[PDB]
Point group: C3
Chain length 314, copies 3
């Protein structure tokens, strides 16, 4: 199989700066090469340079709208672009609002996809709900159909087309959800697994379930949008919003691991890494490798080992 990496050095989805340095640190952590070490061919597409929207106005509360609308428009494009060639898209990112882009682009070639969302937050707030115009906390509200026309069309996201219903999305790692968001997920009946569910079933069953629930009938392609923050802060400290009591490195590596073991991975998102939001240099480095590690997980590497087949190591 083939792998193409897209860098989404962006950050207007939120205030704290650095997230665009995300793909910059990830490649520096040698993400590309290690990936090559697998059975997958890897092509690095570089960093989609994003033209800045002069005089971007705050649509009511929502900020830097046009920016996030055009930046995400440019991305979805490249994604659908690769997706058609048949390669697996892996979006190194800045804030998690590049999810619309990625996800959209993906749905163009595979409109039957599901979505596993590992984030501490649902990020399912709308321009109406959000107590901030930080679109990095709305990505699902743009991709959801059951939410279309449920809020004033936003300046820059015209090209966006609600592509999936709540019956194809699955959240894992939720532990910091806003009122409005809780409403939405309950109302629209969205299958999720808050830390409390993790706690109850155990990552194993959590994954086991989520799968049947999504690939029970028709096996479709998967889009794992992973938010480096959905792990506990002790593991991925260099982030925008940390939230104690989250997924463990182990649990996180278990997810990408069961994901891989299903061969249905199509699109991958490694968002929210802020190479600057480090209390200490280590914390960053930590955050960086664990992230890196989580990628190579989705692409083969098992915690039990790997050995090139047909070769007699004896």
């Amino acid at each position: 199989k083939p792998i193409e990496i897209i860098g989404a050095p962006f950050s207007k989805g939120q205030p704290r700066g650095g997230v665009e340095k995300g793909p910059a640190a990830l490649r520096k952590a040698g993400l590309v090469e290690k990936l090559k070490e697998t059975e997958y061919n890897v092509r690095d597409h570089g960093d989609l340079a994003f033209v800045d929207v002069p005089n971007d106005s705050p649509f009511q509360i929502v900020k830097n709208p046009r920016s996030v609308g055009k930046a995400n428009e440019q991305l979805a494009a490249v994604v659908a672009e690769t997706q058609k060639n048949g390669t697996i898209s892996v979006v190194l990112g800045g804030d998690h609002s590049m999810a619309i882009g990625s996800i959209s682009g993906h749905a163009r070639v595979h409109p039957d996809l599901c979505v596993i969302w590992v984030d501490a937050h649902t990020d399912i707030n709308t321009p109406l709900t959000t107590s901030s115009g930080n679109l990095h906390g709305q990505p699902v509200a743009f991709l959801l159909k059951e939410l279309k026309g449920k809020f004033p069309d936003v300046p820059g996201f015209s090209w966006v087309t609600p592509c999936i219903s709540a019956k194809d999305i699955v959240y894992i790692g939720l532990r910091d959800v806003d009122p409005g968001e809780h409403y939405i997920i309950k109302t629209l009946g969205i299958k999720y697994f808050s830390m409390t569910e993790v706690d109850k079933l155990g990552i194993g069953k959590v994954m086991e379930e989520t799968f049947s629930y999504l690939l029970g009938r028709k096996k479709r392609p998967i889009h794992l949008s992973f938010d480096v923050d959905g792990l506990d802060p002790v593991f991925t400290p260099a982030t925008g919003t940390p939230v104690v009591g989250g997924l463990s490195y182990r649990e996180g590596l278990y997810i990408t691991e069961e994901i891989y073991k299903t061969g249905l991975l199509s699109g991958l998102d490694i968002m929210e890494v802020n190479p600057t939001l480090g209390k200490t240099p280590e914390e960053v480095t930590r955050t960086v490798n664990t992230a890196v590690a989580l990628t190579l997980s989705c692409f083969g590497t098992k915690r039990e080992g790997n050995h090139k087949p047909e070769t007699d190591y004896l």
Copy 2:
């Protein structure tokens, strides 16, 4: 429902000083207000000032007896006092020996209550057993009937009336139990779940069980005496006795969470917080919020979110 908070700034139950600063730090962490943010009405009762017993003699080995006898006598009173009005009692505390007070006061209005004891220790030692007169390690021995007249009446605890048998008490998080104590719990057949049990079943099943075992037949009121030290030291470092390999923040939040989801909470104890026993300021702060967090847990807050009902956030 209504909530009344009682501060038990005390510490003679043990040597290390600071535990009385407990309710002092907890309120400072804004425990009161956050609580108001729920569906419960909250009334802060303040800190029961405790008159000191001049010349308190060490009953054999047991120390500061009269102190702990009168301090706990004053408390039980206020507790039964609120309990009658129908509000939920929440005892911010100093050492865990204010459990007799709280628990007693509670049993006066609801003598059919059970008790969930999250502590690293059983604290079920008697004046006979204890290798210390630290009554913060005997609270159950005073409340237990099967232990009445099993030791020399203690100077100051006359007013104390063994209120519950081993069939209504449940320990969770035990990992540092003394010989004598092991004897007692086995002999008197006390349902418990040592870390090893936690390890085996998984907090989920651990709670699931404990409930049936207590609320299987007659659903009664619950008295969760939570000992901030039953969590692992990495989570609640600012304590008297830390004991590695204990409950995780997650597991601890899972408990208070399943407790809440049963609407049977009547009395709550947040003991053993020593705002001074911090290797570093953070450790305290850590200890403080996690504690605070554990309270608001027992009162609604879920790790999946909360949203005021009947309001359309759309």
Copy 3:
């Protein structure tokens, strides 16, 4: 029952020095006395002084061969020596290559034994595979029959006799396995439980299984070769190779605990402790006690308590 402790202050199995100081720190942590506190009689055998092999040549890639061959020859001997008297052998160690010695010596008296291997690594590499002559990463390859004559006889391990097949060995905690090693374990069909398996089943089921798989038919003696490094680095930092995302103190204490509860413990290995590889003095101390703790676990101590029988603590 009787316990005899053997100190294997050795380290040529690998580069980093200090591991021979292993038994030196363990006794200093009072391992001997605490052990006496159990229902087992304990005899400390002291530290097998190891005569150094002048001019030890690097068999191709493999280093300090003759050293590790004679040091392990001297050990197996003492082990079989005690094993015959009926006492339980407990090898405090230096690098994990003293496993051949221990294990061999054990098989002499009980050739029907199985083996539980808690290590981050399989250490099942051969002189052919290893990208290092560090025999501390080959111990199983010398003890395995299915591997005999699968590599050039090594200078110093003549006396070694492949004693067990892959049907009697069980690995727990694997998370850093080399290519060649993966080949071997898959090929030779070796029952294991990588962190991912731990993650899936939960230490409880992991142990529950491993047992039936080994003691299902004929109950035999157990040889728990525990590698202090198989726990997460946060717990046992003072080691040669740390590997993030490993067994928790709890999970590790759960293992030795279920091991003990089967009364089938015959030989115990507490390897890879490097009293010098400590970022800070605490880290060592940490590493030391947790190790110590893991021993006393295999010998009675439960996390629920212990009380001398036939004594009325009332």
